[PDB]
């Protein structure tokens, strides 16, 4: 289920983080309006860029902690308020998060592994709700 998937992802986190973020950017190319230094790069070139690997790993490190602190795929209000208040998220709306979790769920469905994709769909929907409640536009 969801808890085992956190452990699976954590066991190879930099590859999963990079591959899921690339699935997001490739499905939603307009989302590079928030990632201007990733324009004009293939996936293998992005994986060679220090902040791409570093920042994406740090994003997924925190995402896995928010998932681990959740109950039944519902994140803590304190985690939602952290993600709204972060200065690096000043430009963002809940639709940015919705698209990330659509891509993450599609990535899990396409894998041969027994990911609990429905739980990740719920977690994304519940994180978007918590972000909206905590004041993200
Ligand atoms: C649960 C989901 C998310 C988590 C846990 C998260 C967490 C983080 C963390 C930890 C950082 C700091 C990275 C660093 O400085 O090394 C960061 C920066 C950032 N996040 Fe988020 N984030 C999430 C979702 C999103 C989404 C959906 C977007 C936009 C589509 C986004 C856009 C950014 C941007 C633009 C930065 C700063 C630019 C950069 O670090 O390259 N984040 N995020
Ligand atoms: C959602 C997301 C994924 C990776 C990454 O580097 C940043 C900054 C955000």
Automatic annotation (TrEMBL):
Binding locations of heme b 11: 88-89, 97
Positions with a binding annotation for heme b 1: 55, 89
Annotated heme b 4 binding sites: 36, 55, 89
Keyword flag Metal-binding: yes
Residues at which heme b 9 binds: 55, 89
Residues where heme b 3 binds: 55, 89
Residues the record lists as binding heme b 7: 55, 58, 88-89
Ligand binding (heme b 6): 51, 55, 89
Binding site for heme b 8: 55, 89
Entry superkingdom: Eukaryota
Keywords in alphabetical order: Heme, Iron, Metal-binding, Oxidoreductase, Oxygen transport, Peroxidase, Transport
Residue ranges constituting the Globin domain according to the UniProt record: 1-136
Binding site for heme b 5: 37, 89
Residues bound to heme b 12: 89
Record InterPro entries: Globin, Globin-like_sf, Globin/Proto, Mb-like_M
Binding residue positions for heme b 10: 58, 89
Database matches in PROSITE patterns: GLOBIN
Similarity field: Belongs to the globin family.
Protein name: Dehaloperoxidase B
């Amino acid at each position: 289920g969801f808890k085992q998937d956190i452990a699976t992802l954590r066991g190879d986190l930099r590859t999963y983080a990079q591959d899921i973020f690339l699935a997001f950017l490739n499905k939603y190319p307009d989302e590079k309006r928030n990632f201007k230094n990733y324009v004009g790069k293939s996936d293998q070139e992005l994986k060679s860029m220090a902040k791409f690997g570093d920042h994406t790993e740090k994003v997924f490190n925190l995402m896995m902690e928010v998932a681990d602190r959740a109950t039944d795929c519902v994140p803590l209000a304190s985690d939602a308020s952290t993600l709204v208040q972060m200065k690096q998220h000043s430009g963002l709306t809940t639709g940015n998060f919705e698209k990330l979790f659509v891509a993450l769920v599609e990535y899990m469905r396409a894998s041969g592994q027994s990911f609990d994709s429905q739980s990740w769909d719920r977690f994304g929907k519940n994180l978007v709700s918590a972000l909206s409640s905590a004041g993200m536009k």
